[PDB]
Amino acid sequence: CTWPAWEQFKKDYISQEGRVIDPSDARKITTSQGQSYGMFSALAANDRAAFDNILDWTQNNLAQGSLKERLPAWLWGKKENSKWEVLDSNSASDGDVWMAWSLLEAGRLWKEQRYTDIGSALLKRIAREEVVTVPGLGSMLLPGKVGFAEDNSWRFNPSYLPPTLAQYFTRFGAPWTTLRETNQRLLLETAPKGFSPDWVRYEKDKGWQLKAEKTLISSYDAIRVYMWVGMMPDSDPQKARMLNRFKPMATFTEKNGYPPEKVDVATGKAQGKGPVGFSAAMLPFLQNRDAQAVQRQRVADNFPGSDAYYNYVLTLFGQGWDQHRFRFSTKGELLPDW
Numbered sequence: 596c597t598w599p600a601w602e603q604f605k606k607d608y609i610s611q612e613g614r615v616i617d618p619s620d621a622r623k624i625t626t627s628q629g630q631s632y633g634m635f636s637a638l639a640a641n642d643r644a645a646f647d648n649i650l651d652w653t654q655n656n657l658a659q660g661s662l663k664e665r666l667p668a669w670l671w672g673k674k675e676n677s678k679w680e681v682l683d684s685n686s687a688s689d690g691d692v693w694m695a696w697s698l699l700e701a702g703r704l705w706k707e708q709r710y711t712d713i714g715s716a717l718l719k720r721i722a723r724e725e726v727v728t729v730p731g732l733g734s735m736l737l738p739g740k741v742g743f744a745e746d747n748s749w750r751f752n753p754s755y756l757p758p759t760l761a762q763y764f765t766r767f768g769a770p771w772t773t774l775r776e777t778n779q780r781l782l783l784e785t786a787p788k789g790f791s792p793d794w795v796r797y798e799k800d801k802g803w804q805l806k807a808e809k810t811l812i813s814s815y816d817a818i819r820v821y822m823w824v825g826m827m828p829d830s831d832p833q834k835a836r837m838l839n840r841f842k843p844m845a846t847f848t849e850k851n852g853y854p855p856e857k858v859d860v861a862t863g864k865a866q867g868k869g870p871v872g873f874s875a876a877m878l879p880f881l882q883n884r885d886a887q888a889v890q891r892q893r894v895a896d897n898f899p900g901s902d903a904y905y906n907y908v909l910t911l912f913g914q915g916w917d918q919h920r921f922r923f924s925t926k927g928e929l930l931p932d933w
């Protein structure tokens with residue numbers, strides 16, 4: 596009745612006060628993504644005590660006491676003066692949506708109104724403060740409250756809204772109804788060579804900016820795109836189109852025995868070998884049994900230690916899924932394995 600990988604994650608990465616820590620950074624930071632992944636994982640493990648502890652810290656330290664009053668700051672850590680506090684109060688929307696989804700699902704599954712209430716308020720503020728109408732697209736999720744929108748151009752992060760979460764959110768009406776559709780557009784239209792970019796710009800009157808560019812590569816952010824798609828139920832009509840679009844990533848992995856570290860989105864040219872986390876991300880994504888098993892071996896033989904926040908978090912999701920630790924319904928709900 597425990598999720599061993601999660602139990603080890605708590606010991607190595609989660610403080611007594613409930614903050615998820617990336618030890619690789621000298622400021623020993625906590626991110627809103629980290630908190631949301633901890634909430635998700637706690638929920639999947641049926642670990643309410645940890646869910647509550649992580650939620651408390653999040654509200655108190657990232658939201659000045661309340662997720663109903665503001666989106667959580669994305670970055671928290673040690674300052675030069677020795678004080679520990681928010682380092683950037685801007686939000687990161689991937690943490691935000693995962694946080695809202697976990698909360699809403701915690702409310703439903705544990706039958707607790709307080710989680711629903713916080714989840715709803717959070718989701719509404721997301722829609723109001725980091726969702727905007729873009730000419731040529733309609734409603735789009737910005738990667739954050741500020742810094743990603745100019746008068747005539749926007750920058751998006753395809754990895755931020757998993758299609759399952761998008762589907763889940765539709766039950767709440769506008770603008771989520773539309774976002775589920777524009778999210779598909781973002782994912783399908785910006786992968787000309789079958790690789791999703793970490794970041795991608797859109798300009799009014801011109802459209803997607805898909806010429807070769809520094810951040811127009813499939814690396815640490817984008818690797819999650821393939822994982823989210825693989826986590827979609829077969830009965831999600833969007834899944835087939837997405838698997839087809841991203842096939843060259845599956846083909847590369849099968850052929851080379853590993854996922855690439857970086858891929859030029861405009862040319863499809865690959866470089867390096869991705870870390871163990873990337874292999875975990877492939878487990879739900881790859882449909883070929885043998886290829887799946889090759890990645891499974893790599894995760895097993897190079898399982899992340901205590902000095903590897905990102906690999907570990909990818910592993911919780913990827914290997915977690917490979918081990919039936921959680922599943923998503925056709926409506927984006929958590930089907931728990933408790």
Ligand SMILES: OC[C@H]1O[C@@H](O[C@H]2[C@H](O)[C@@H](O)[C@H](O[C@H]3[C@H](O)[C@@H](O)[C@H](O[C@H]4[C@H](O)[C@@H](O)[C@H](O[C@H]5[C@H](O)[C@@H](O)[C@H](O)O[C@@H]5CO)O[C@@H]4CO)O[C@@H]3CO)O[C@@H]2CO)[C@H](O)[C@@H](O)[C@@H]1O
Pocket residue numbers: 626627628629669683685686687688689690738739740741742743816
């Ligand atoms: O140049 C114009 C004007 O202002 C200054 O330039 C601006 C620039 O125009 C803005 O775009 C830029 O905006 C940045 C935000 O201030 C900053 O908060 C945001 O930080 C991101 C961060 O980049 C990103 O890594 C992080 O993502 C997290 C996600 O959860 C996941 O992807 C994963 O977990 O990785 C991380 C950590 O977990 O999110 C944060 C928060 O959204 O980045 C914006 C873009 O860089 O600000 C500049 C300065 O204000 C310029 O200096 C002036 O001269 C000029 O007049």
